[PDB]
Design a protein around this ligand. Structure first.
Ligand SMILES: CCS(=O)(=O)N1CC(CC#N)(n2cc(-c3nc(Nc4ccc(C5CCN(C)CC5)cc4)nc4[nH]ccc34)cn2)C1
Length: 291
């Protein structure tokens, strides 16, 4: 509905996030001019290809309704109905990556496992639509309140072809290589199982509390050698992963939780756990610490 969010009533307030190809702004929608705060995603450095990808992303988000997925509100066909902007609920505590850093002193293991469980259920839901997220990372998780997080961005999400259980990317632009499964690096293959690999990296991130020098890029670069540049980095990352190099157990991380991470990081795609497996395992851990 192009009349739902009219550009003349959508007022900019603050910048919330920004990257090479997109940004999110805090805006106020006041049709009666005298209104709700919303989050608005727009492209940056747009092209016809990027705009078509953005249309697919909007359709993906519109099709999702789940407690742990940020809520679609609509679209603004701005610039006289010659451009597109995506309208979403505003989540007041921002990205989980920043929230964990700001509030680590009140976030214990059982809280981390609540966030883990919630991310997992969002991903179970995504898989029922045959969507592959391809960019799971704490920077793409948003915090609604102390007890609720949601997957907040779907800019790299792809729909599986009807007769295959993987999506093969041809020319990969934005590639978060230090979250990628080995078969994504070596064969450009993305699947539910590669999302599970990346979820293991998210779980690692959580239990580092986003401490300085413990991020996946920083750790993998320290193991590879900080002087390496360009494709050499990739070559070494592939060799490292294929022969069982892995992110370390974070300081203070229980062995049981590191074991979850390492089971997600199986080079054998079919042996990785399912998101249903993981959600039940994590919720049983929480419940057996204390319900
Ligand atoms: C393609 C690149 S992108 O730019 O498009 N990309 C998407 C991207 C990553 C993800 N997911 N993102 C999304 C949002 C976003 N934020 C919010 N609320 C918010 C509230 C408060 C603060 C403050 C800032 C200052 N201080 C640190 C404390 C928190 C920030 C945000 N609500 C939202 N609803 C939907 C989206 C969204 C933000 N970043 C980044």
């Amino acid at each position: 509905d192009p009349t739902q969010f009219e550009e003349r009533h959508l007022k900019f307030l603050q910048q919330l996030g920004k990257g090479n190809f997109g940004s999110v702004e805090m805006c106020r929608y006041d049709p009666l001019q005298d209104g709700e705060v919303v989050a608005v995603k727009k492209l940056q450095h747009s092209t016809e290809e990027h705009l078509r990808d953005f249309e697919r992303e909007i359709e993906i988000l519109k099709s999702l309704q789940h407690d742990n997925i940020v809520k679609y509100k609509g679209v603004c066909y701005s610039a006289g109905r010659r451009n597109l902007k995506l309208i979403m609920e505003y989540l007041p505590y921002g990205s989980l990556r920043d929230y964990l850093q700001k509030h680590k002193e009140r976030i214990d293991h059982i809280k981390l496992l609540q966030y883990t469980s919630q991310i997992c259920k969002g991903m179970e839901y995504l898989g029922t639509k045959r969507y592959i997220h391809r960019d799971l990372a704490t920077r793409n998780i948003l915090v609604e309140n102390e007890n609720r997080v949601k997957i907040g961005d779907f800019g790299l999400t792809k729909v599986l072809p009807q007769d295959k259980e993987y999506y093969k990317v041809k020319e990969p632009g934005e590639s978060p290589i230090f979250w990628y499964a080995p078969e994504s690096l070596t064969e450009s293959k993305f699947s539910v199982a590669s999302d599970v690999w990346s979820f293991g990296v998210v779980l690692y991130e959580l239990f580092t509390y986003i401490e300085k020098s413990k991020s996946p890029p920083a750790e993998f670069m320290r193991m590879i050698g900080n002087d390496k540049q360009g494709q050499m980095i990739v070559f070494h990352l592939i060799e490292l992963l294929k022969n069982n190099g892995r992110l370390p157990r974070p300081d203070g991380c229980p062995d049981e939780i590191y074991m979850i991470m390492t089971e997600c990081w199986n080079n054998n795609v079919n042996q990785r756990p399912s998101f249903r497996d993981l959600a039940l395992r994590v919720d049983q851990i929480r419940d057996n610490m204390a319900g």
